[PDB]
Design a protein around this ligand. Structure first.
Ligand SMILES: *[C@@H]1O[C@H](CO)[C@@H](O[C@@H]2O[C@H](CO)[C@@H](O)[C@H](O)[C@H]2NC(C)=O)[C@H](O)[C@H]1NC(C)=O
Ligand SMILES: *[C@@H]1O[C@H](CO)[C@@H](O[C@@H]2O[C@H](CO)[C@@H](O)[C@H](O)[C@H]2NC(C)=O)[C@H](O)[C@H]1NC(C)=O
Length: 205
């Protein structure tokens, strides 16, 4: 009865244009606001991964330990849909100055009363010593070294969870909205850009 349409929400890698993930559900524009799930490594761009000449940088999506150390690093998120000059643009992840963040996971627990979403780390076993002392866990790509237990495809172990806020559930979604995500480190804070958009189509069969 309330299932008038098939609403699909998509999280997009801003730079590459690829789909980090998607979720569909039946309902209306006012009640279809599902919880989204995606991995950080599916939204990074060409300039995120540290160079190969760079010794144990502490983050990155191209190597298991890089992915693991990245997982244990805090991060903050800034909206790029509000046109706040002081926060800068995509090249700053919309976080040019402190106070631009509206969510994420850091010691000061950023939240917001005006932004449309919240983003927190999901659950993962990441990496752990198992049985024979070797390293086991999802951070390892099962398609790069099978046998290594826990190994997931892609080596995904940076799950993020996105939820819509009350303000988010009440704002208009005509056109995509973008956000920037930054790792909070003692040194450069790498930038990852993503977008959220909605499609509304008829049900089938
Ligand atoms: C509309 O909703 C339906 C489910 O109610 C979606 O249909 C499934 O979509 C997945 C991929 O997203 C396919 O792998 C399944 O085979 C589809 N099931 C069938 C046969 O309906 C559909 O994707 C949604 N609209 C779209 C195409 O975005
Ligand atoms: C892509 O999105 C789907 C949801 O459409 C994710 O699947 C959900 O994952 C959570 C967390 O593990 C579970 O609690 C749900 O039960 C899952 N839902 C369904 C329908 O499977 C999926 O994990 C996401 N993929 C990635 C790598 O983020």
């Amino acid at each position: 009865p309330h299932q008038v349409y098939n609403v699909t929400w998509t999280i997009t890698n801003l730079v590459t244009g690829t789909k980090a993930n998607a979720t569909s559900m039946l309902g209306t524009l006012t009640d279809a606001f599902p919880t989204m799930y995606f991995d950080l490594c599916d939204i990074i761009g060409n300039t995120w991964n540290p160079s190969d000449q760079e010794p144990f940088p502490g983050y990155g999506c191209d190597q298991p330990m890089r992915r693991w150390q990245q997982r244990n690093t805090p991060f903050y998120v800034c909206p790029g849909h509000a046109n706040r000059k002081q926060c800068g643009g995509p090249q700053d992840g919309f976080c040019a100055v402190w106070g631009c963040e509206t969510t994420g996971e850091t010691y000061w627990r950023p939240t917001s009363s005006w932004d449309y979403i919240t983003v927190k780390k999901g659950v993962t076993q990441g990496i752990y010593q198992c049985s024979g002392g070797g390293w086991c866990g999802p951070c390892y790509d099962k398609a790069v070294h099978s046998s290594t237990t826990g190994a997931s495809e892609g080596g995904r172990c940076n799950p993020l969870i996105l939820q819509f806020t009350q303000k988010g559930r009440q704002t208009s979604w005509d056109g995509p909205k973008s956000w920037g995500l930054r790792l909070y480190r003692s040194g450069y804070d790498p930038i990852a850009l993503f977008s959220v958009s909605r499609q509304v189509m008829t049900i089938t069969p």
